Design a protein around this nucleic acid. Sequence first.
RNA 1: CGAAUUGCAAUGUCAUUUUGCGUGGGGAUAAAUCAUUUGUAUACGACUUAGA
RNA 2: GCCCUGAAAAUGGAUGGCGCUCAAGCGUGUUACCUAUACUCUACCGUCAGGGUUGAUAUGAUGCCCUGACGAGUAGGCAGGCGUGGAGGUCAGUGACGAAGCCUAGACCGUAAGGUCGGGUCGAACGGCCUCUAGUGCAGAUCUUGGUGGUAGUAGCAAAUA
RNA 3: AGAACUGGCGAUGCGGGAUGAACCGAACGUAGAGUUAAGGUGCCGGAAUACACGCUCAUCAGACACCACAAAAGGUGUUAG
RNA 4: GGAAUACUGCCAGCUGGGACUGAGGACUGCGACGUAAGUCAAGGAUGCUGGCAUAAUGGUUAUAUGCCGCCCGUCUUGAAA
RNA 5: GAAAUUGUUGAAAGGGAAGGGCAUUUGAUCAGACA
Lengths: 106, 197, 175, 61, 127
Amino acid sequence: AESHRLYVKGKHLSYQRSKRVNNPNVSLIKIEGVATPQDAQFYLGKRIAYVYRASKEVRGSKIRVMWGKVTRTHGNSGVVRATFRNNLPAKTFGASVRIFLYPSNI
Amino acid sequence: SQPVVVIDAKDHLLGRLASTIAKQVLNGQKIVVVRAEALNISGEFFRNKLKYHDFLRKATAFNKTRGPFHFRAPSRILYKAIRGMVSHKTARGKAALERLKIFEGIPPPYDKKKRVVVPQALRVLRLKPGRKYTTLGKLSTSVGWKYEDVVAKLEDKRKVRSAEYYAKKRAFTKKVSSASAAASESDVAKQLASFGY
Amino acid sequence: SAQKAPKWYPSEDVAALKKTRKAARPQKLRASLVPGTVLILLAGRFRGKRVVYLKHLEDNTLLISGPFKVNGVPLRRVNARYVIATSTKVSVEGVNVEKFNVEYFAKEKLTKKEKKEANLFPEQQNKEIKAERVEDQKVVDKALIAEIKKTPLLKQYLSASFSLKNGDKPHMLKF
Amino acid sequence: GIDHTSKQHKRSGHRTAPKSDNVYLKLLVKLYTFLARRTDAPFNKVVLKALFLSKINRPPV
Amino acid sequence: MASLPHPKIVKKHTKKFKRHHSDRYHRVAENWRKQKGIDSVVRRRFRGNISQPKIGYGSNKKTKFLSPSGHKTFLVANVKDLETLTMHTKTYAAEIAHNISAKNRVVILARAKALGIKVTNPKGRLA
RNA sequence: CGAAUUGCAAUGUCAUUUUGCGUGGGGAUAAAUCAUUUGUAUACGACUUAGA
RNA sequence: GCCCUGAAAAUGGAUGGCGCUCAAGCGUGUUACCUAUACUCUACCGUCAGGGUUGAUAUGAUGCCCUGACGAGUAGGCAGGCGUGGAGGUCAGUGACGAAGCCUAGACCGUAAGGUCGGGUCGAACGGCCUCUAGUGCAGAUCUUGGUGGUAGUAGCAAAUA
RNA sequence: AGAACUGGCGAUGCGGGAUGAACCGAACGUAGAGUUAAGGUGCCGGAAUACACGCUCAUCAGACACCACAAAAGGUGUUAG
RNA sequence: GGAAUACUGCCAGCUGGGACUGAGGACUGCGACGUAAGUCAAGGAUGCUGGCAUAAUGGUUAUAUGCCGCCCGUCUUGAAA
RNA sequence: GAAAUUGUUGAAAGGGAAGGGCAUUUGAUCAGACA
């Protein structure tokens, strides 16, 4: 009763990168609770929101959301790749995004 | 999953603990590392003392107060280890090292909190039985730390209160378990047991 | 003469499209959605609620009626992707659902362009729930609660709401 | 990367229009382009490729 | 005016291609000049430096010379220049020249309103 | 007994520091610097002294 | 085979750093994974080549359209364009109801050279297109002339007794 | 110092070798998606604190070829023959 | 003596999830299923629904953050020097 | 009545330079409304 959440909390780790070159169009998301690429395959295509604050109350509220989705699975340990409409601003490296269950197959 | 993670740093290896801390604190986790004077480090004590006296040589020639600052506390030796694994010259690494607090002994905020153990850094699980190792408190005292006796006088004073808290809690759990068996036979428990519970 | 004209100005009247070859076909729902199952709604005003699935419509939506007497989710549509189909079923043959279609839920209002100027309570046909709707809503759950009440704890289950706990890994746990 | 055999982007070394600005030679090229495009006789292609030549490749007969 | 014949005007590299070291010195303007130097990192195309004009950045020939409104802007100076646009209304957009006076702009704008042509600066010398 | 009409999803806002204003309800009544002066101090600042 | 000794140089220092010891070392093997401007597919730009269309539609085929391949580059060659001062035509072009000029983290077009518009200032002439002509495009030459900075309220303004 | 053949740099960016004109991979219009090369996957740093069999404890261990120094001669130190 | 299974290969076997792309613009073509009319996933995207009609969204600009980025011209085998 | 250079006001940033490239947040500004 005290809980209401219908998402899985994850962290925004980093951009997709080489050593010394980063590609800001693809972000890496660490979904908390996932350990392998199989069972990271469950969350593919699910929506992600990044909810943050501002000071300009636009459209009736002060909190804002950057939407995106999970696209594929990253290397060997349950990290996934994500693409957003406007990319994540690289000050959120180590910040909580929320992975919804909106396109579901269950 | 907790907001703040308190790591009881007894019997942990230095650079194997520091890598896990420097990855978690960059992922965004607030970590305090308590009881840092009981950290282990592989290699024999004279080997690690010769490595620290090799570190003591490297100071700026023309003005020594600019050079590498050789901190002598065990918490600051572990902090040097973690800061070598964080990109501490940028805003991201500077903000990641502010999620870290390292203490020798257990301060009174974290006296009454649950401590965790990192198993991929434990000396017991990682070193071969028979290898020699070094304790960071003895190494710090040998290289010039001053408060080994103070955090040992303040430690057993904490351990007395903890071991007299644990006896009261143990008697509480024995009084709970002597009366919780009166309900384990009934229909609610025989229905709960089919569900695994 | 600040800009002289083109060689002969190719005229650009509209030209019709080519003949497409995209014929729409019926949806193929996933096999876990049979009518009578219990769905968990994941998005919307009634998110987290547990409803009963009754009928597949023809705009590829599901018709759900978690009993109003149970949790207050009326007869409505969901998108078949924002639902989680659980394992539990009820016997849905008892209810009569053939009077429901897309024109049943079609709203015959007029606010279809003026939502940029409708900002100070226009009071235009917004809050009138007539007896055409609630009379049909009574018969579909008076026959549904009489099937829900056969099994124990199902009415409390449908009156409760779903949430994820601290250790709940949704890729592992069943439904 | 392609291991090229020939030189890339090589123009054919034949002029495909007269370098003259003559209107009455432009009209003859307009005529013989139609004839060479829509007949099967090689005479029109010979006359069309001969209308393009310069003054030293059109010597007097 | 539906004006919808054109499709999704995209623009690769909407940035400006300023000259190298135009921000460093005041004598060097921001008009683009190719770096012809022998040790020029901009000419030798290193990583992290500015990018030069190539033909790869060219625009789609269907959506070239079009405004975001979808027309080609055509400069007019009087009503006889407006009359060349009266049968191409959905594809062109008239634009009054900068040196037309305020007395003649209210004539050109009235003629363009009577002809249906879209003027892209109807607020110049409006008073 | 209610929760329908947030219309097939659009975070659908609940948390915590800084700060100012307003009401009523208590509480407390100061020093520092310049200027003058000393020379245990002093290139200048600084330091150390004195003065209702 | 590994390790040690043999193995010594001068600022403090370098498997890149932290650090690592049933390795995060060495020898070897098996997979999974990371990613270049490279390979594959798609879109667009350009160049080259091949082919279609003077039914006659805007007499134009300079075009339009279909297909395929390709795109590094100094010295250098060629081509297509942008900009300047004057000249011959034309727009019966703009203008004291404001020409030119100048300012403008205001807008649009072009890959770019550049072009156009709005606002402020300003006060008498100036542009578009087809051509002609050249004293025609600057970041440099310890470049020429002019103007102005940091240094900098700084060095200093202390010989000849007051 | 002087030659022979090929490849390259000069004229050349890009991924790797920390950095380097010449080494490895691969040569470049503008973008998207996928897959790889050379090199890597404790942390900096994207990627297995993978798996499997052994060896080594160094009072200056050792760790990516070019490459950024190393021999003769010893050690019942340890292992195998 | 009878099998089974591993391994390797083939299927013009079935089936589930995810990502990027929708170029072209009357008809023509090759096929498929149909007695036929016709229909189709067969020479490149359509259908339904909802929100906003402007701080939706987009452009420029300043700043912050992650990663990269040595000062240009010239001579030179080689210039940040 | 341009620029270098300077004063005032306004906005912003600032741990041993500053400037630049790719991407997005935040502030300002502009856009067309699909009218």
